[PDB]
Copies of this chain bind each other. A is one copy, B any other.
Amino acid sequence: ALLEICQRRHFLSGSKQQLSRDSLLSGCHPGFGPLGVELRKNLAAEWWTSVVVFREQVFPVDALHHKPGGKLRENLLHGALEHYVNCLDLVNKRLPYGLAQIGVCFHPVFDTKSIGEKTEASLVWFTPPRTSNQWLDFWLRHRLQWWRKFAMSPSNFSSSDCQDEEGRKGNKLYYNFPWGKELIETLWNLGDHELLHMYPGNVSKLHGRDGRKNVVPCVLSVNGDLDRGMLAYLYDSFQTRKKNLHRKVLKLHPCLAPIKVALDVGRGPTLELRQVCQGLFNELLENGISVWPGYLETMQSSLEQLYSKYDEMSILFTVLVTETTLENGLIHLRSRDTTMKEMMHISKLKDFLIKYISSAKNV
């Protein structure tokens, strides 16, 4: 409950003091900083990869923010439900099939009169009644698995089995914040009620081929708050006894980490073949890895200062270009997980970073 200063100093959040847990959990926050929206960006991308791309029968859906008939959408489930028939047509009535969409939703909140918005990643899984529960447990285990990685302590993420007011099964996902558990994702099994209500005339356009027979689809639904999730990983990244020596650093997963590497200039001052830093810069961004530029600086200070400055930004590696490297071709490298000086080659550094992220995606 004191890493907030690290979020203000290094903008993963707003510099406003009024950032209470209520203001963060309601979505009434003034907004996220560049590093924060980048972190959430990589988080949502990691969602999209491990939910939409690898798994077939799942297609993107674009739901509007409002209704043609003022209050906005509370959930982007219904907007996806409106796109059921056409998406049935593009799948040739082959269910199970799902529609996924990551969009901001607007929730009315009575602060004890306002309205708070928050980014939500939703997947609506149209699945036959015969295998509804199986897909529910499936998505439970898989979502919980997706959230239990990227974490330094996966024990904080939990799942709760719960029933509806009528009896419909469902599962909730929690993250153990320092003040208790908090809801981060919800999974429910909707017994084809809303689809039936949306199409009262001809229900024949709702029938989906289960295999040897066309059945009415049961509507599974999973909605994940990525703001509370980004905050969850934000808290999880930060460090707790008899360590005898402490350093301020948040350990975010290399995949979702906002800024991957940090390029600077050492020794210092050296003119004027420093345009090689530009080369390494464009080369790095060409491969799609985030690089912070340490060119125009006021420090000119202890290396511990910008090292801690980079550790507060969860920057994986710190590449240092010096005149000796200008001579031979071996720049410096300081890892975040293990603060240790290491020499390496340039293209070797590029491929090392690419292999680092790519393998980090793996086991």
Interface residues of A in 81-99 (CB under 8 A from B): 82-83, 85-87, 89-90, 92, 94-95
Known contacts A10-B86, A282-B53, A293-B57; A62 and B31 CB within 8 A of each other:
yes
User: Could you tell me if B15 and A117 are in contact, using CB atoms closer than 8 angstroms?
Assistant: no
Please, how many angstroms separate the alpha-carbon atoms of A82 and B36 in the complex?
16
Interface residues of A in 292-343 (CB under 8 A from B): 293, 295-298
Interface residues of A in 103-126 (CB under 8 A from B): 104, 106, 114-115, 117
Known contacts A62-B36, A66-B106, A106-B66; A83 and B13 CB within 8 A of each other:
yes
Chain B nearest CB: distance from A191 CB in Å? 25
User: Is A139's beta carbon under 8 Å from chain B?
Assistant: no
User: Could you tell me if B11 and A37 are in contact, using CB atoms closer than 8 angstroms?
Assistant: no
User: Is A256's beta carbon under 8 Å from chain B?
Assistant: no
User: Is A68's beta carbon under 8 Å from chain B?
Assistant: yes
Chain B nearest CB: distance from A70 CB in Å? 7
Chain B nearest CB: distance from A298 CB in Å? 6
Per the CB 8 Å criterion, the residue count for chain A at the interface is 59
Interface string of A31-56 (1 = CB under 8 A from B): 11110111001000000000011111
User: Could you tell me if A60 and B82 are in contact, using CB atoms closer than 8 angstroms?
Assistant: no
User: Could you tell me if B83 and A31 are in contact, using CB atoms closer than 8 angstroms?
Assistant: yes
User: Is A136's beta carbon under 8 Å from chain B?
Assistant: no
A59 proximity list for chain B (CB < 8 A): 11, 34
User: Could you tell me if A293 and B31 are in contact, using CB atoms closer than 8 angstroms?
Assistant: no
- Out of B31, B95, B281, B293, name the residue touching A63 (CB < 8 Å): B31
Q: Can you list 5 residue pairs at the A/B interface with Cβ under 8 Å?
A: A31-B63, A31-B82, A34-B87, A41-B60, A64-B117
